[PDB]
Design an enzyme around this catalytic site. Sequence first.
Site, PDB file in Angstrom:
ATOM      1  N   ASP A 140      51.884   0.070 112.008  1.00 55.28           N
ATOM      2  CA  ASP A 140      52.104  -0.715 110.688  1.00 55.28           C
ATOM      3  C   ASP A 140      51.063  -1.619 110.419  1.00 55.28           C
ATOM      4  O   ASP A 140      50.703  -2.357 111.298  1.00 55.28           O
ATOM      5  CB  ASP A 140      53.682  -1.307 111.076  1.00 55.28           C
ATOM      6  CG  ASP A 140      54.185  -1.701 109.756  1.00 55.28           C
ATOM      7  OD1 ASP A 140      54.346  -1.348 108.656  1.00 55.28           O
ATOM      8  OD2 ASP A 140      54.414  -3.108 109.925  1.00 55.28           O
ATOM      9  N   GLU A 166      48.843   2.969 108.341  1.00 52.07           N
ATOM     10  CA  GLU A 166      49.410   3.144 107.003  1.00 52.07           C
ATOM     11  C   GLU A 166      48.584   2.085 106.071  1.00 52.07           C
ATOM     12  O   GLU A 166      48.770   0.903 106.509  1.00 52.07           O
ATOM     13  CB  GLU A 166      50.824   2.823 106.785  1.00 52.07           C
ATOM     14  CG  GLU A 166      51.164   2.843 105.304  1.00 52.07           C
ATOM     15  CD  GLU A 166      52.498   3.092 105.103  1.00 52.07           C
ATOM     16  OE1 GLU A 166      53.678   2.953 105.991  1.00 52.07           O
ATOM     17  OE2 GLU A 166      53.061   3.632 103.965  1.00 52.07           O
ATOM     18  N   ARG A 221      51.808   5.231 115.426  1.00 59.09           N
ATOM     19  CA  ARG A 221      51.689   4.859 114.078  1.00 59.09           C
ATOM     20  C   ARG A 221      51.783   3.199 114.093  1.00 59.09           C
ATOM     21  O   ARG A 221      52.779   2.582 113.942  1.00 59.09           O
ATOM     22  CB  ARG A 221      52.595   5.497 113.212  1.00 59.09           C
ATOM     23  CG  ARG A 221      52.392   5.434 111.894  1.00 59.09           C
ATOM     24  CD  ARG A 221      52.281   4.361 110.979  1.00 59.09           C
ATOM     25  NE  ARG A 221      53.556   3.476 110.769  1.00 59.09           N
ATOM     26  CZ  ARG A 221      53.968   2.828 109.922  1.00 59.09           C
ATOM     27  NH1 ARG A 221      53.531   2.667 109.016  1.00 59.09           N
ATOM     28  NH2 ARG A 221      55.180   2.456 109.949  1.00 59.09           N
ATOM     29  N   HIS A 255      58.740   6.952 103.970  1.00 61.62           N
ATOM     30  CA  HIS A 255      59.595   5.802 103.951  1.00 61.62           C
ATOM     31  C   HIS A 255      59.291   4.932 102.942  1.00 61.62           C
ATOM     32  O   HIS A 255      59.977   3.840 102.428  1.00 61.62           O
ATOM     33  CB  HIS A 255      59.578   5.024 105.275  1.00 61.62           C
ATOM     34  CG  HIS A 255      58.255   4.773 105.746  1.00 61.62           C
ATOM     35  ND1 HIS A 255      57.211   5.706 106.137  1.00 61.62           N
ATOM     36  CD2 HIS A 255      57.600   3.453 105.658  1.00 61.62           C
ATOM     37  CE1 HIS A 255      56.189   4.916 106.465  1.00 61.62           C
ATOM     38  NE2 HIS A 255      56.321   3.727 106.394  1.00 61.62           N
ATOM     39  N   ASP A 256      57.883   4.944 102.527  1.00 60.71           N
ATOM     40  CA  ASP A 256      57.296   3.810 101.500  1.00 60.71           C
ATOM     41  C   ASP A 256      57.280   4.457 100.186  1.00 60.71           C
ATOM     42  O   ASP A 256      56.516   3.917  99.279  1.00 60.71           O
ATOM     43  CB  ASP A 256      55.859   3.415 101.958  1.00 60.71           C
ATOM     44  CG  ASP A 256      55.874   2.509 102.981  1.00 60.71           C
ATOM     45  OD1 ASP A 256      57.000   1.722 103.145  1.00 60.71           O
ATOM     46  OD2 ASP A 256      55.186   1.873 103.392  1.00 60.71           O
TER      47      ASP A 256
END
Length: 686
Positions: free
Chosen positions: A229, A257, A227, A327-328
């Site tokens: 970032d 993301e 993933r 988390h966001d």
Amino acid sequence: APDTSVSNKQNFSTDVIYQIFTDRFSDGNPANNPTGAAFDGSCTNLRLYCGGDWQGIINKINDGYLTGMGITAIWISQPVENIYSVINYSGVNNTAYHGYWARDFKKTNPAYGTMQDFKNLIDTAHAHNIKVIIDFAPNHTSPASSDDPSFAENGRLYDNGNLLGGYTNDTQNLFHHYGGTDFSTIENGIYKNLYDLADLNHNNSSVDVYLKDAIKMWLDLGVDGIRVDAVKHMPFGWQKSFMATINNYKPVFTFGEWFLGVNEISPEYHQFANESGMSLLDLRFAQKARQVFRDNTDNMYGLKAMLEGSEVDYAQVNDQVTFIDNHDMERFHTSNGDRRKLEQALAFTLTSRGVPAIYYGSEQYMSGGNDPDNRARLPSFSTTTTAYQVIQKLAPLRKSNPAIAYGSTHERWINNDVIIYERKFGNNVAVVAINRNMNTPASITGLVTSLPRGSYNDVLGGILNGNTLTVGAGGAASNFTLAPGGTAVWQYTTDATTPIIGNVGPMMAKPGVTITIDGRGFGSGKGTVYFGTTAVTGADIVAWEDTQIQVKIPAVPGGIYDIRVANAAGAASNIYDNFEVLTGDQVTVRFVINNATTALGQNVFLTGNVSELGNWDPNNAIGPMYNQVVYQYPTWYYDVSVPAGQTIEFKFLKKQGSTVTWEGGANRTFTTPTSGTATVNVNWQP
Ligand SMILES: [Ca+2]
Ligand SMILES: [Ca+2]
């Protein structure tokens, strides 16, 4: 091996990802805990280390917490060594508990564990058929002030213990020094620093090569997915050469993301998912799911329009990772929110297209606002919550029912509060009915499905007040009342007799690379896979079985190909399009063109003679090029992934609407490097 095997690192639609903030999950080894100001064992200061580590996750796989729930993939914090500083941001002390403030991408963060602890995590996970996805944040190192070299660790980057450099006195330009982003443009957010994080310079060849060697090391340790970032903050051309490094070496599922707020729809977001070589966190799904199921700022027609629309807009919708919180964003469950809202949104996500990710602690109804409040230590490892049971019952259908893993989505009944949808793949069907109204039952009449006749028992066992579905002839279901808050899942599985392709991974690689085609009905006997019209047979088909083919990409010219499988009996599957064959290994070249003055609405683009440059086609030209941060107008610049080691021919052009203005003169030639980067600095040829 079958599509559902743990060793299928290319495609994750048959998996359910459990996203872990390593520090907030379980502390299995107290001896590796940070000490002093960097640690808080009570985890009431959510910016400090609470102590959770990779031995804590191993333990939770081992004792059945995660495998009891049906999780088959865990997504953990970035594993690499982070800075050790406790940064005081205006009174609050802050540490790298999140793994995002890297200092050495070749070593582990010792609070999480040693390199042996990471190998033990990989092996324990694999032995329990759990895939391990790591965050990897190649955009920056850590908080840095070049003005104050003593702040934090001055963004320093080490390469396996060896210091490469810091932010102050960056004579090698390992970092960007353009100030911080105000996020006003994509260009601005790429080249300027994200907050105070020392922005890595990917056009520096030693940064480029380091990061590509570092991800290969993690691929060698056996990770199954990545993933990435801050994909919106790195050059697209650089991330495509980074994706090519992974796919041409050891392709594993990669997603990034790119944040989108509520109802924000961005073309570049979709162009990134469709063209980068990595998929994305499905923000569009997450936001509409929270709008329908949580905030009630939209109804089932919005949900329907999103599922319908996204099936078209994502070239590979089965690769987008869906979620209802992470988390966001604020935890989906609020203090005054009905738990049934969480439970339905989880049943919706687990039965929807894509790769579902469950944010740790969702099964324990954690509520919390935004960062860091959405990252508390999870309070309990209780296996008897309804949410745990919802995941336990539904997450194995991803492996067992091809329709949920790969199927199309067909709304079969709808009104403001109720949606009944069907997932269909070959003959495999799943039907999910959801009544979000917690007060009024729904009278369902006239429901037709593709289920064969029978009395389908709710896979959820009535725990979300679902019911049996009696289906008669022609898939007509006997009328029923869907309980307030009712959620039911009914399914039927059989063998697909005809090849059907549900997913292919990787979607971008050079000739010679083995890709994984998953689906059903391929048969046991080796048949043919077509890239365009090119047939691949025999020894080039590395592996053939009914649910998975591994085939070497044929030596076809670079470009975009439709893939189709013919089984041994000559029957052909559906087309899986948008496969990019690369001209070869990739390098990122910065192209800079001076004196390209443009009118309003006219931008400079680049095309050339390889597929990577759009094969001379203005509609596929690379751009709009940039012209504000690294170089200013009338100099335009852009980082572009191009085949390494060869002479490309190219030309720049201006486009304004339907008018292409080509550079005059002869075509430009450039011989690309074999690795590392290069900069082409040229002047507009009138
Ligand atoms: Ca620990
Ligand atoms: Ca950047």
